[PDB]
Symmetry: C3
């Protein structure tokens, strides 16, 4: 009898972690940091709803394709949702110049207010009602974009248009207009009389003379003609003047840019639900509590950092071991209120007290090290949506290689940090356990025999209140020295 052992926690845990050195290492306590689920729904972002475009493209929305919903309420939005291949775009076919740049403006815009700048009924000298088409059906009747006017010769005459608008608002105006490219020389005269026309636009920054480019083209949405749209931002206190002799697709409504901020165009097929989120991906929203996730790289909102991993587990406690007779052989299920501690084995005692002078000192630096790991990726790369046209494949690939490149870099960093500090965490517990034993051996010097399994046997009587002499860094050699003095030479001369 008369012993004492140094030992460590063990429990029912089957959590597993990895290191540089080993895989699947069972530990007492561990912390998952990777989010892997989403809810498959499309939600408001912290109370603010997305602008859902349904089957419409940004072009169809902005020009007012009759199949598309106008937003009369002038709502603000958190993000914009556009399907992958929207069916309602330029119902009258053609091109929309610097479309992808316009879409990129929307990513920093959170609210429009449509304002009328040239009322449809202010074109005295021209036909403002015949410009409609079977390609733009509203309720099965031929119609046209709601926000631009297809002006047409009146009484076989098309008087020169010169018309100006002064931006007397505080806000930038987004202004859109267009030009008609007819099918042949006869069509041009039929519509606009004058055989050779132009559309001239002028601001303090933009000077442009546009000219109708006639070609023989195959039918799109039934039509061989085309229309080409343009856009500009008219700054506060600047003015814009249009002059045309024909083919002018004139603006009616402009868009006051009333709120700039963090926004996005998300490409998703989902539809909106009664749902709110902190973090939205194109395939569903995420419970943003953990610091990493692998759901989708184009997450927006207050999001965890995206990494290309199947798992990310930080070790926090000891390995999980029976585990009998001191630390050399494993950990104690019997120890409950601590990670490292002791075992009494007394004339009075049984054992299993915990040393929380070093248990708390370890729970201190572990939970401090954990938060440090997470916050070290506070500035981790976050991907940003952009689109490119079919003649911008190089910069599109540049952009892909950059974003994938940063995701790979940070994936690597996140993994390496976890593996490396995991090895350091497990190694710390080892050194803490080995430190505990040494604290005791440096106290009980001669008065006890090292048993080689993690326990000491006393060459003297100790009793319970000396069993905290040893725990409290207080045991004094002298006051038990003379008793030990004698009993060990009794061993040296016993049987």
């Amino acid at each position: 009898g008369d012993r004492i052992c140094i030992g460590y926690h063990a429990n029912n845990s089957t959590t597993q972690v990895d290191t540089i050195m080993e895989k699947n290492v069972t530990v007492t306590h561990a912390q998952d940091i990777l989010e892997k689920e989403h809810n498959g729904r499309l939600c408001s972002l912290k109370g603010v709803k997305p602008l859902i475009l349904k089957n419409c493209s940004v072009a169809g929305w902005l020009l007012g394709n009759p199949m598309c919903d106008e937003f009369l309420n002038a709502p603000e939005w958190s993000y914009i949702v556009e399907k992958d291949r929207p069916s309602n775009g330029l119902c009258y076919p053609g091109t929309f110049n610097y479309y992808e740049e316009l879409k990129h403006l929307m990513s920093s815009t959170n609210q429009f207010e449509k304002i009328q700048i040239f009322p449809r009924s202010s074109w005295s000298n021209h036909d403002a009602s015949s410009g409609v088409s079977s390609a733009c059906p509203y309720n099965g009747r031929s119609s046209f974009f709601r926000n631009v006017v297809w002006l047409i010769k009146k009484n076989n005459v098309y008087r020169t248009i010169t018309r100006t608008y002064n931006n007397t608002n505080i806000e930038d105006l987004l202004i859109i207009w267009g030009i008609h490219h007819p099918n042949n020389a006869a069509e041009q005269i039929k519509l606009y009389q004058n055989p050779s026309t132009y559309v001239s636009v002028g601001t303090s920054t933009l000077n442009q003379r546009s000219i109708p480019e006639i070609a023989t083209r195959p039918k799109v949405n039934g039509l061989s003609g085309r229309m080409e749209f343009f856009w500009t931002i008219l700054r506060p206190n600047d003015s814009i003047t249009f002059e045309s002799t024909g083919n002018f697709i004139a603006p009616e409504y402009a868009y006051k840019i009333v709120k700039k901020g963090d926004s996005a165009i998300m490409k998703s097929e989902l539809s909106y639900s009664n749902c709110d989120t902190k973090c939205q991906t194109p395939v569903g929203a995420i419970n943003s509590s953990m610091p990493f996730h692998n759901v989708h790289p184009f997450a927006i909102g207050e999001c965890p950092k995206y990494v290309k991993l199947k798992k990310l587990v930080l070790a926090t406690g000891l390995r999980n071991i029976g585990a009998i007779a001191g630390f050399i052989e494993g950990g104690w299920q019997g120890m409950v209120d601590g990670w490292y501690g002791y075992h009494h084995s007394n004339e009075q005692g049984s054992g299993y007290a915990a040393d929380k002078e070093s248990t708390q000192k370890a729970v201190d630096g572990i939970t401090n090290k954990v938060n440090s790991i997470i916050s070290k990726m506070n500035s981790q790369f976050e991907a940003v949506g952009k689109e490119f046209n079919n003649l911008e494949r190089r910069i599109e690939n540049l952009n892909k290689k950059m974003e994938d490149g940063f995701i790979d870099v940070w994936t690597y960093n996140a993994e390496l940090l976890v593996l490396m500090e995991n090895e350091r965490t497990l190694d710390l517990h080892d050194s803490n356990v080995k430190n505990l034993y040494d604290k005791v051996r440096r106290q009980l010097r001669d008065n006890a025999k090292e048993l080689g399994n993690g326990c000491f046997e006393f060459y003297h009587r100790c009793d319970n209140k000396c069993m905290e002499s040893v725990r409290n860094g207080t045991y004094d050699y002298p006051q038990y020295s003379e008793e030990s003095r004698l009993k060990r030479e009794e061993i040296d001369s016993g049987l």
Copy 2:
């Protein structure tokens, strides 16, 4: 007499590794992971040959510059090889719009099939044979691009061309055409009669009216005129219509895009050899076995990861030490079948048995850690060729800074990983050796005296079959205890 020692491997090795802390550290076993050689040849990639362009540029190939080889076999290719400054390009001088975007399409294309869409002899109303030039010699005779037709007025008349082609194939078609920019007003009439002309092209996506831009220009390849080429991809089931009144350089042959995939345009001066490779760089092919290389950043194929380093050596075993009398003084050349082990020194024995309970346990986690290091760069950045024109210097520099930037990042990572796990590898062996000694000291407790050099001397007789009691974690103190009991007090009372 009566001893036993704890010791470690040593051998003839002069392999050297580095750590954060020290350079040039001699070790027992080490693993080079950096490829530094190439074969200076240009090879097929895994059985598939490159498309070698010789002295021709992609433009010269595609338009059929008479000096360039057509590939009648419609071969597939693994990569394309273009010299740095090819001598055969636009033999008739001019410009090729969105050339760099076209070249970027080739990087995802692996096979063309040339098809005739407008046969050269189908231009009834025009001269399809006089459009040839001293600038385009075929066998010293004046000639012209093989795949486009320089249509010319017939009988002093040039009737309006309107001509259509429907893509009734499964595959995308690459279609090229052009327009002639004459030298002066008289030249225009001499060639095309009609003083004011255009070239109009129309598909469902492309609308274009082109106009001849006359200027007085210095001679290139002898000529002051210029020709400007265009290209489009005509989707399956779409049609393309051309209309011109003059200056039309019409297409004859289009290119069926029959195989898309991983390809590249490599800028190299080398010529092809009977040679196959897994990994090709512009200065030679590489033996893709090691995980890193430093030959060239624009390697393609199944390649090691490129890093800007002169060396990369992983330590696998112990440092390399004579080295006498236990681990405190160095390693044993005498130990051969293990990294750590013992030395007998018995009434019967000599020594040098190896502890492979911990040798194999170390060879386990070292070879497992090695593979983990390599696979951690599986997603390392790989550079991708692209070209830019002289008005795209900003995005060209963006692209350079990005690729060099990622190469630097991964160079850093690769080096830091090797140095850091090298320090961890050497430190592991130390702790393994120190662990071995402790296993023995915790067994032989009182029965032996620690000699302070890594060896124990027995206070009792052991014999050979107890010398595996100690090796096998099986030695029991008690069955030799009473013999030791007596002999140590004989030391305490000897001479």
Copy 3:
């Protein structure tokens, strides 16, 4: 009496470092590596002065806006300084095509030489003196750009200009010209007679016919007309020919590109001082001695690496502890000439000698590890200035995300390296101190009793010259063995 202790340095230091595990760790010796100050001045770079543009933009400089200084001395420069919103640019309003590409050329250019190519007085057939404007005041009198000529009809006639210049210099020429866009059809005739005009330019690489685009525009700097400028680089031995029938803004002076190299356009509001620097940022110059800084990301010159951190401190020495009686309890202020060492306590002695066999061996690998850390970021990312126009927002954001992305990556690396090697540095000292004790215990074996506080008490007389037996790895057990032999059994039988 009769003792000896193993101990470590301690001193007056209050330097603090951090690790992964702990913050604010007081150490004996530490090395700041982060530069955080600048001098708020704009300096020459290593003897070479910046080209200070004052209130002028690159356009105003190059065209010779009468408000801008010409640099008649043809100076070379280290960088160019442009204010954020320069007030003197196109005094006659309009556009400058591929302006941002031109600015990017300046970033690789270090010296121009202005040369006259078409002398202002060589335009016999035209009015070379009436083209001046109230928008371009020189000394309150109407004037015009100094380097281009606004040619005007002479005697109500404007004869066709055809004019050529051959670049017979070694150097590339930067050549600028322009075209006038009038306000209305009457203005065109008033100025250039001929109602329909063009400006044609031709080199071996550039073919261009420019056409005047009339529009009704609001007044900028008082004027509603606009002028559009163009530029090209004319290679040595190439020639450029201009032809116009009106609206030609002709070149007078071209710029010989005489020195290429490392340069930059810095956006700064500062003005130049009698000051020289190695490293210049837009808000001030930096004392480039330390390896990192956080002053500004757009630093140029021979600069430390920019990181987004408030502090970066490498630990070099031990933690800073009174600290009595051996290493178990803290470090010795009393030890002065070393980091680790001993304490005598002799019949003759007091103590405090330093073990510089391991002190120098640690100062060796610490100062070697430090330099290794710095040089590992030799290839760290460095940001590069570029500008983008209002239709290049996507590539501008691409460029921002790339540069911020690399700065974040390297910020992370720098921090992680310091924290991790800091933990390794502190841990090294611990292991060095623990190694010292063990060197002594493996010598003095039986002859001394381990006191458990870091000190040994001798069972024999040692004297001073044996106190270096112990320090010099030379103490021999035998020559004191028989004396110890007896005195310990006197303890075993004392009182």
